[PDB]
Amino acid sequence: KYDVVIIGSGPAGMTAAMYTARSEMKTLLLERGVPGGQMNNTAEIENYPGYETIMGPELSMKMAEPLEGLGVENAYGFVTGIEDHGDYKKIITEDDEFITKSIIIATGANHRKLEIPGEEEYGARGVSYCAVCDGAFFRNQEILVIGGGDSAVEEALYLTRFGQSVTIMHRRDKLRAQEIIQQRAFKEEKINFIWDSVPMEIKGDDKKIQSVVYKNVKTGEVTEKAFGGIFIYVGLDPVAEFVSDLGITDEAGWIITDDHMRTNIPGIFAVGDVRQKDFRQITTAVGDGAQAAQEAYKFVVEL
Amino acid sequence: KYDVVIIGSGPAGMTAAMYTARSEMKTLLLERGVPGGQMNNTAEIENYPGYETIMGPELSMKMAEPLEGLGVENAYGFVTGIEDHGDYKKIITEDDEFITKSIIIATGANHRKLEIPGEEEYGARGVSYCAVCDGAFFRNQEILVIGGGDSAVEEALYLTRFGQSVTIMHRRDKLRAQEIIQQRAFKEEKINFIWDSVPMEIKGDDKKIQSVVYKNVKTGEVTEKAFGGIFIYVGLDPVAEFVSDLGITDEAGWIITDDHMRTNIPGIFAVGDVRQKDFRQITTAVGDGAQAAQEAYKFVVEL
Ligand SMILES: Cc1cc2nc3c(=O)[nH]c(=O)nc-3n(C[C@H](O)[C@H](O)[C@H](O)COP(=O)(O)OP(=O)(O)OC[C@H]3O[C@@H](n4cnc5c(N)ncnc54)[C@H](O)[C@@H]3O)c2cc1C
Ligand SMILES: Cc1cc2nc3c(=O)[nH]c(=O)nc-3n(C[C@H](O)[C@H](O)[C@H](O)COP(=O)(O)OP(=O)(O)OC[C@H]3O[C@@H](n4cnc5c(N)ncnc54)[C@H](O)[C@@H]3O)c2cc1C
Ligand SMILES: NC(=O)c1ccc[n+]([C@@H]2O[C@H](COP(=O)([O-])OP(=O)(O)OC[C@H]3O[C@@H](n4cnc5c(N)ncnc54)[C@H](OP(=O)(O)O)[C@@H]3O)[C@@H](O)[C@H]2O)c1
Ligand SMILES: NC(=O)c1ccc[n+]([C@@H]2O[C@H](COP(=O)([O-])OP(=O)(O)OC[C@H]3O[C@@H](n4cnc5c(N)ncnc54)[C@H](OP(=O)(O)O)[C@@H]3O)[C@@H](O)[C@H]2O)c1
């Protein structure tokens, strides 16, 4: 009844849907929230070819714009499950079911948690996983950013707009971030570093964060230091709970595909960050999305 | 001496270079002509996520813009050959040599020729492979477009701005183009179709084209009909003459890679249209380019 349903409207899904709709496939694009996915939690995007710098939510709007007009059917849905009946598939949301010949899973990835004490207790009140969302609540604070990759270092640079100081705590003595971003952080006077360390405890009042306890991973030296905010960027977990049962995931829960975005299950493809892969970028989300869209077209034609 | 040299500055190369430069790799981007590659011969681009419609040369300029500032070294060069010495590679242009630890080949693809009589004789004078380049020289003419894929049908639609009429001649009774573009062509009153036919001869004066002879592929019926211009869009050939000897091409001359853009030869990657693949788009050029850039970084780090 749908030719293709695409689950998730971040850049991978939105590219897939644009392409399926241009192949005049009966296209459903389901998204639980706002079109744009992680791009809406990104302040400044500098590496999307075609734009020299653009706010994440502006790029989100631009990618979402033509979809209506191409005839993609955009709809709210939180997908809870998928059933492989052989020549059709059923997608289950909170209130609905949808029948489709093919599915493109584009549901992305989510912030990994530290799993330390205080992390949940201070969720509304000093702990954040999103700088563009929360940063201005930390004006004049001493902010702490945990992690050494692209997200930690970029989001630290952004947060220097608000904080008195921003400190990056990384568990080794070399960052994983792109060298250009590393160099910017090294040069920025409002960024400090706690190398070779991991956080152990986040402490505060009833009402807000006050301090973090942490450990040096080469010596075991333990330190406690005052901070007003903590932003955590320690990696990603897959957002694929609705396919746990299906046999298409690895041990960590990422969706396994071949190089044409095919899973085990014929007619089910996956694209973008939710796939098992090392390189998570808008450019490769877009690429994945287009390739899936073409493979879906062909799968459906063969049917 | 270079960490990476990227050969070709269409969208795959320009994405690769942006990424290598952001990893602070010593980056050379060699291009024989204008940055943009095929995008400069494209009138209107509707399917690049992030832009709802954009002229090909405008998107080319936008992708080229930040490269200087990131520290990519942009240089003229026509590459004639590459030598694999083991821990370095030599790239040979018309006048120069360049030594590099890794190479990303992004040289794209070129118009296939009909190989029929009159095709060369009328090259300056009625035969074209590029509508945005030549179309306004055919104001008020009866134009013929050969082919049934995305290029033929899109470029026919563009050419209706100039021609009295534009006729698409396809060798089957169903187009290969994306359905949205097919439907636009079906509806456009200035587009006619010659189905199930191939051109046999292009005829004219000393000075210009006047007529085409063609054949119906189901009946052998031969017809000759008057046209002022002929635009040929019958597919693509690889632009990889500089690696013929190297053992990295298929029988047709496309560069073979795995899913991380690696060839046989370690430290030589290829991206975008020049690779062996079915799906040639800006989105997948960009994707390829980013993935190559990451793999080059890692190759060079290991070295
Ligand atoms: C802070 C930050 C900065 C970044 N900056 C850059 C950058 O500058 N350049 C760059 O190239 N990359 C950047 N990235 C990486 C990039 O954003 C991602 O690679 C890209 O967004 C992945 O797109 P995607 O479509 O696969 O998933 P996502 O963007 O993750 O979109 C997934 C969508 O699926 C939806 N969804 C999830 N589950 C369900 C469900 N069960 N039912 C319905 N809908 C669902 C979500 O709401 C979401 O909208 C950044 C990442 C972060 C975190
Ligand atoms: C008429 C037309 C319309 C199109 N429209 C669309 C569209 O709307 N959307 C879409 O997604 N895709 C479109 N495409 C496909 C798209 O343009 C290509 O997929 C894309 O440009 C491929 O990029 P690339 O970087 O691999 O190669 P190219 O863009 O082909 O760039 C290759 C570059 O390498 C250079 N080069 C070649 N040989 C050498 C040498 N020996 N030394 C130095 N430099 C060299 C060339 O000058 C060129 O600039 C279109 C194609 C055509 C022909
Ligand atoms: N501009 C961009 O292109 C951009 C921007 C943001 C994100 N992304 C991409 O998105 C993906 C996710 O990025 P990411 O930065 O969120 O995650 P990531 O690449 O997994 O990096 C997580 C970082 O946090 C470190 N870490 C893990 N646990 C820690 C702890 N307990 N204490 C201190 N440090 C710890 C990791 O250490 P190790 O390094 O030791 O593992 C790593 O440096 C990546 O592929 C990334 O390239 C891209
Ligand atoms: N908007 C876009 O995304 C866009 C725009 C342009 C190009 N592209 C991409 O670029 C790549 C190249 O496109 P393309 O259209 O140039 O080439 P293509 O996809 O190979 O199509 C060539 C078309 O010409 C036909 N043909 C071959 N020889 C012929 C002859 N002698 N007489 C009549 N018809 C003949 C082919 O027939 P058969 O179909 O029988 O083989 C085919 O329909 C494709 O992957 C395409 O999708 C994309």
- Which domains can be identified in chain A, with CATH numbers? 1-111+236-302 (3.50.50.60), 112-235 (3.50.50.60)
Q: Encoding tokens for residue A234? A: 């320690």
Q: For residues A103 and A267, give the distance between their C-alpha atoms in angstroms, rounded to a whole number.
A: 6
Cβ(A173)–Cβ(A198) below 8 Å: no
Amino acid letter, residue A84: D
Q: Is the CB of A41 under 6 A from ligand 1?
A: yes
Phi, psi of A156 (to 5 degrees): -60, -45
Q: Which residue has tokens 């134009």?
A: B143
Q: For residues B252 and B194, give the distance between their C-alpha atoms in angstroms, rounded to a whole number.
A: 29
Q: Which residue has tokens 């990451």?
A: B294
Q: How far is B135 from chain A (nearest CA, A)?
A: 26
Q: For residues B137 and B121, give the distance between their C-alpha atoms in angstroms, rounded to a whole number.
A: 18
The number of angstroms, rounded, from the C-alpha of B249 to the middle of its chain's C-alpha atoms is 18
* CB of B115 less than 8 A from some CB of A: no
The 10 Å Cβ neighbour count of residue A113 is 14
Percent helix, strand, coil in chain B, to 5, is 30, 30, 40
**Residue among B63, B278, B286 whose CB faces A286 most closely:** B286
Phi, psi of A85 (to 5 degrees): -85, 150
Q: For residues B222 and B212, give the distance between their C-alpha atoms in angstroms, rounded to a whole number.
A: 10
A19 and B291 within 8 Å at the Cβ level: the answer is no
Active site annotation includes A133: yes
The nearest alpha carbon in chain A to B280 belongs to A291
Q: How far is CA B60 from CA A255, B10, B231, in A?
A: 34, 8, 23
Q: For residues B237 and B4, give the distance between their C-alpha atoms in angstroms, rounded to a whole number.
A: 26
Phi, psi of A185 (to 5 degrees): -70, -40
> B7: helix, coil or strand?
strand
Closest-CA residue to B66 (of A165, A51, A285, A151):
A51
Q: How far is CA B257 from CA B226, B268, B278, in A?
A: 45, 10, 13
The 10 Å Cβ neighbour count of residue A303 is 12
Amino acid letter, residue A33: G
Q: Encoding tokens for residue B98? A: 């360049």
Closest-CA residue to B93 (of B32, B11, B165):
B32
**Residue among B51, B178, B287 whose CB faces A283 most closely:** B287
Going by the DSSP 8-state scheme, the letter that residue A35 receives in this structure is T
Q: Please, which experimental method was used?
A: X-ray
Q: For residues B149 and B234, give the distance between their C-alpha atoms in angstroms, rounded to a whole number.
A: 8
Compute the CA torsion angle A181, A185, A187, A191 (nearest 10 deg).
170
Dihedral sign computed on CA atoms, order A162, A164, A170, A173 = positive
Active site annotation includes B205: no
Cβ(B64)–Cβ(B9) below 8 Å: yes
Q: For residues B177 and B180, give the distance between their C-alpha atoms in angstroms, rounded to a whole number.
A: 8
Q: For residues A49 and A46, give the distance between their C-alpha atoms in angstroms, rounded to a whole number.
A: 8
Q: For residues A226 and A220, give the distance between their C-alpha atoms in angstroms, rounded to a whole number.
A: 19
Cβ(A74)–Cβ(A31) below 8 Å: yes
Q: For residues B47 and A294, give the distance between their C-alpha atoms in angstroms, rounded to a whole number.
A: 13
The nearest alpha carbon in chain A to B14 belongs to A49
The 10 Å Cβ neighbour count of residue A68 is 11
Q: For residues B128 and B123, give the distance between their C-alpha atoms in angstroms, rounded to a whole number.
A: 7
Give the burial string for B248-273 (b: 16+ CB within 10 Å, else e): bbeeebbbebeeebbbebebbbbbbb
Q: For residues B174 and B199, give the distance between their C-alpha atoms in angstroms, rounded to a whole number.
A: 17
Closest-CA residue to B289 (of B9, B23, B16):
B16
Residue whose Cα lies nearest atom 45 of ligand 4: it is B280
The 10 Å Cβ neighbour count of residue B189 is 7
* DSSP-derived pairing of the beta strands A191-194 and A197-204: unpaired
Q: Which residues sit with their C-beta closer than 6 Å to ligand 4? A: B 47, 146-152, 154, 169-172, 176, 198, 233-236, 280-281
Going by the DSSP 8-state scheme, the letter that residue A275 receives in this structure is B
Q: For residues A4 and A29, give the distance between their C-alpha atoms in angstroms, rounded to a whole number.
A: 9
Resolution in A: 2.0
Q: How far is the CA of A145 from the centre of ligand 3 (A)?
A: 12
Which secondary-structure segment (H or E) carries B44? strand B44-45
Closest-CA residue to A145 (of A180, A184, A194):
A194
Cβ(B214)–Cβ(B200) below 8 Å: yes
Closest-CA residue to A105 (of A124, A121, A86, A82):
A82
* CB of A272 less than 8 A from some CB of B: no
Q: Encoding tokens for residue A139? A: 């004006």
Q: Encoding tokens for residue B291? A: 């993935």
Q: For residues A96 and A99, give the distance between their C-alpha atoms in angstroms, rounded to a whole number.
A: 10
Q: How far is CA A104 from CA A36, A288, B40, B201, in A?
A: 16, 10, 32, 46
Residues 6+ away with beta carbon under 8 Å from A258: none
Among B52, B254, B282, which residue has the most ligand 2 atoms within 8 Å of its CB, making it the best to mutate?
B282
* DSSP-derived pairing of the beta strands B97-105 and B268-270: parallel
Cβ(A61)–Cβ(A36) below 8 Å: yes
Q: For residues B16 and B106, give the distance between their C-alpha atoms in angstroms, rounded to a whole number.
A: 9
Cα three-residue angle A262-A266-A270, rounded to 5 degrees: 35
The 10 Å Cβ neighbour count of residue B186 is 11
Q: Is the CB of A234 under 6 A from ligand 3?
A: yes
Closest-CA residue to B253 (of B270, B231, B233, B267):
B270
Q: How far is CA B17 from CA A285, B72, B74, B294, in A?
A: 18, 7, 10, 11
Q: For residues B144 and A94, give the distance between their C-alpha atoms in angstroms, rounded to a whole number.
A: 54
The nearest alpha carbon in chain A to B285 belongs to A287
> A155: helix, coil or strand?
helix
Residue of B3, B84, B130, B150 with catalytic role: B130
* CB of A19 less than 8 A from some CB of B: yes
